[PDB]
Amino acid sequence: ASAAEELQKSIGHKPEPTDEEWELIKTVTEAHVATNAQGSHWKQKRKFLPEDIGQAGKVDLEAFSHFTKIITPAITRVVDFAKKLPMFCELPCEDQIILLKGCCMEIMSLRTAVRYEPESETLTLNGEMAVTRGQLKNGGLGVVSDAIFDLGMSLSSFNLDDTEVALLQAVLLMSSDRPGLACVERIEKYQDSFLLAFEHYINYRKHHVTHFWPKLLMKVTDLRMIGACHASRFLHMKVECPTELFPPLFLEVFE
Numbered sequence: 001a002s003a004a005e006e007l008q009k010s011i012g013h014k015p016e017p018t019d020e021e022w023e024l025i026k027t028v029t030e031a032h033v034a035t036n037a038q039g040s041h042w043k044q045k046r047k048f049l050p051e052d053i054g055q056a057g058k059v060d061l062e063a064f065s066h067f068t069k070i071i072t073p074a075i076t077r078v079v080d081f082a083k084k085l086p087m088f089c090e091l092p093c094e095d096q097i098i099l100l101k102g103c104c105m106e107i108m109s110l111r112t113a114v115r116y117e118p119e120s121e122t123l124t125l126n127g128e129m130a131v132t133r134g135q136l137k138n139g140g141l142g143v144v145s146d147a148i149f150d151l152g153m154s155l156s157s158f159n160l161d162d163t164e165v166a167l168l169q170a171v172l173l174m175s176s177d178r179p180g181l182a183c184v185e186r187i188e189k190y191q192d193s194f195l196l197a198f199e200h201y202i203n204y205r206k207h208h209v210t211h212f213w214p215k216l217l218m219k220v221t222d223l224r225m226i227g228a229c230h231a232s233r234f235l236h237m238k239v240e241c242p243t244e245l246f247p248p249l250f251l252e253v254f255e
């Protein structure tokens, strides 16, 4: 189980998901697939943003406007993902907003990075709007745009499926280091159940890529970095752009 994990590996075998883990895996996957804008066919049904909005330095009002106008639906799908996870529900109100505010940008940026399109060198926001590096940058994200784009390009080789993306989200969600958490121990035990099932799913997947698990975990910290760096970007925006231009849900998640 969680203990018999050493010998098994120490002899050279890689345990695949136990039956209990297979259920957790299906729960997390369904939760993700059901709340991910579009699905399978997300890329023929997407519109590029006119090459003039991104103004191809103050934040470009037009881009910021187009981006903030569709941010509420994005945040909402993240809360929805969390709600479909039994472990999340087993936590106190106080802790739940904490976890959500903490992983929101981490998960959202993962969802747009995983949909990087190398042909047109674009990322797609909310499954509809496809933007370029500069557009997203000038829209208000600054270097965050570069971070997500670089993550996206690197992720191409990982060939992640819905389950792997879902498990990543689950690991980001259950972060017991968020300041102000009450149930630090319980939340850490949950992230452990996810990481254990995740690693096992990876052994079952058999990616023809060396040290997949470790490299994959490094992406975790990058997403955490993208989030922390976005919070700063948020302060840079609250000092230029006016409040009226900040969707109420967008304001409560990041401040």
Ligand SMILES: O=C(O)Cc1cc(I)c(Oc2ccc(O)c(I)c2)c(I)c1
Binding pocket: 037, 064, 067, 068, 070, 071, 074, 108, 109, 111, 112, 124, 125, 126, 127, 139, 140, 141, 148
């Ligand atoms: O793709 C999805 O599911 C969700 C998603 C939606 C958007 I709009 C988005 O861009 C942001 C995010 C924060 C921010 O302050 C600004 I300005 C723009 C990203 I990155 C991801």
Ligand SMILES: [As]
Binding pocket: 083, 088, 089
């Ligand atoms: As609930």
Ligand SMILES: [As]
Binding pocket: 093, 094, 097
């Ligand atoms: As509360």
Ligand SMILES: [As]
Binding pocket: 182, 183, 186
């Ligand atoms: As608790």
Ligand SMILES: [As]
Binding pocket: 143, 144, 147, 225, 229
């Ligand atoms: As950064």
Ligand SMILES: [As]
Binding pocket: 228, 229, 230, 232, 233
């Ligand atoms: As920053």
Ligand code: NA
Binding pocket: 146
């Ligand atoms: Na650049």
